[PDB]
Design a protein around this nucleic acid. Structure first.
Ligand code: TMP
Ligand code: CA
Ligand code: CA
Ligand code: NA
Ligand code: NA
Ligand code: NA
Length: 316
DNA sequence: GCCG
DNA sequence: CAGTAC
DNA sequence: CGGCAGTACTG
C-alpha cells in the first residue's frame, strides 16, 4: 500500500459515517479505500485517481487535497459524538440506532450504560466482555478452540467434518473469533447433533454465554481452561453436505469478497447465498430459481466464470 | 460515497 | 416488524 | 433516479 498517507485520513471519515448510520456513504468510502490499498502504485494525479474504479470526482477532490495540502479539512468537523458512538456500538448487540438513542439520553461512558441504560441480554453479555471482544487471539488459540469443538462433535459421530472458517481459514496470524462449520458426507446425520453438541460443550464449562440459539446457527462465548485465558466469540453452524461448499465460501469471507461475488452473481441472473448458487433467479424493482450443483468452491468460481481464488487472496 |  | 449480526 | 448481499435470531 503506497497510499497510506491517504487511506489513513479517509478511514476516519468512513468510520464517522458508519457510526452515525450513513451506511451507504460509509460503503463507498470503504470500497474507495480498498481501491487505494490495491493500486500498488502511489497515485500522483487527479486524473489517475478519478480513473480508478471505486473512485469518483468527490473522492478525487478529497485525495488531491490530501496530496497537495497534506491534510483534509473535513476531518476538522467530525461531530464530537463520534467517539462516544463508536464506544457504544462496540458493545455486541448494540448498533447505530441504540448508540444514538443512548447518546440522545445523555449517556457518555460505559459506566453510564452500566448504571443507567436498559440492556438486552445480548448487550449485557457484550458489555461484560467488552475488552475481550475487542481483542484478537493468536490463530494457535483458534486451533485449540476448533479442536475442542471437533472433539466434542466427533464423539457423537466420527465421520463429522468440522472446519474453522473466517480469517482463520484465510491464513491470518490473529483472529477476532472462531467460526466452526460442521457437516457429514452421509447427507442425513446433521440433525440433533447440534443441540447435544452444545449441551456437551456447556457441561464441560467451555461455553460461558449464549448470544444466539437457532435451529442451525449458534453464536456465543467460550473460554479454554487454565490460567491466562480470555473469553472468545465462538460461532457454530451445521449444514447439509450439499451446501457445504457454499457455506465454506460464505463463512470464509471476507465480507467484501462475498458481497462482490454476490453482486456479480446477481448481474449474471444468478443468486449466491450461504446455501446455494441459483440460476435464472427472477427479480424486478417471486424468483424461485434453480439450484446449481456446487460440490466444491472451485465449482462456484467456475459457474460464475471466475478463476479460483485460494482463501488467502479473499480479503476483498 | 460510487456506479449503471 | 426494526435492529443487529454474520 | 436508485441499488449498494442475502439470510436468520431477538424482542
Ligand atoms: C461482517 C460480515 C461477515 N460476513 C461473512 C464473512 C466473514 O468471514 C464471515 C464471518 O464473520 P466474522 O468475520 O464476523 O466472524 O461472515 C458476512 O457475510 N457479512 C458481514 O456483514
Ligand atoms: Ca473471522
Ligand atoms: Ca457521488
Ligand atoms: Na473510477
Ligand atoms: Na455492536
Ligand atoms: Na463469526
Amino acid at each position: 500500500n503506497h497510499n497510506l498517507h491517504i487511506t489513513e485520513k479517509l478511514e476516519v471519515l468512513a468510520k464517522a459515517y458508519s457510526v452515525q448510520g450513513d451506511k451507504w456513504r460509509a460503503l463507498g468510502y470503504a470500497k474507495a479505500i480498498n481501491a487505494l490499498k490495491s493500486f500498488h502504485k502511489p497515485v500522483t494525479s487527479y486524473q489517475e485517481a478519478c480513473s480508478i474504479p471505486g473512485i469518483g470526482k468527490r473522492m478525487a477532490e478529497k485525495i488531491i487535497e490530501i496530496l497537495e495540502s497534506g491534510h483534509l479539512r473535513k476531518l476538522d468537523h467530525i461531530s464530537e459524538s463520534v467517539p462516544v458512538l463508536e464506544l457504544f456500538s462496540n458493545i455486541w448487540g448494540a448498533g447505530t440506532k441504540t448508540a444514538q438513542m443512548w447518546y440522545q439520553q445523555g449517556f457518555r461512558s460505559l459506566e453510564d450504560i452500566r448504571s443507567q441504560a436498559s440492556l438486552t441480554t445480548q448487550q449485557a453479555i457484550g458489555l461484560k466482555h467488552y475488552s475481550d471482544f475487542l481483542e484478537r487471539m493468536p490463530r494457535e488459540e483458534a486451533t485449540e478452540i476448533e479442536q475442542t469443538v471437533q472433539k466434542a462433535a466427533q464423539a457423537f459421530n466420527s465421520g463429522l467434518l468440522c472446519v474453522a472458517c473466517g480469517s482463520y481459514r484465510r491464513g491470518k496470524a490473529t483472529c477476532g473469533d472462531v467460526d466452526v462449520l460442521i457437516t457429514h458426507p452421509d447427507g442425513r446425520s446433521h440433525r440433533g447433533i447440534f443441540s447435544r453438541l452444545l449441551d456437551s460443550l456447556r457441561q464441560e464449562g467451555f461455553l460461558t454465554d449464549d448470544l444466539v440459539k437457532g435451529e442451525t446457527k449458534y453464536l456465543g462465548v467460550c473460554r479454554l481452561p487454565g490460567p491466562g485465558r480470555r473469553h472468545r466469540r465462538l460461532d457454530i453452524k451445521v449444514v447439509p453436505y450439499s451446501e457445504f461448499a457454499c457455506a465454506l465460501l460464505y463463512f470464509t469471507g471476507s465480507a467484501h469478497f462475498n458481497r462482490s461475488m454476490r453482486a456479480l452473481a446477481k448481474t449474471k441472473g444468478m443468486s449466491l447465498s450461504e446455501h446455494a448458487l441459483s440460476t435464472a433467479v427472477v427479480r424486478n424493482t417471486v424468483g424461485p430459481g434453480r439450484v446449481l450443483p456446487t460440490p466444491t468452491e472451485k465449482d462456484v468460481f467456475r459457474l460464475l466464470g471466475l478463476p479460483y481464488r485460494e482463501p488467502a487472496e479473499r480479503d476483498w
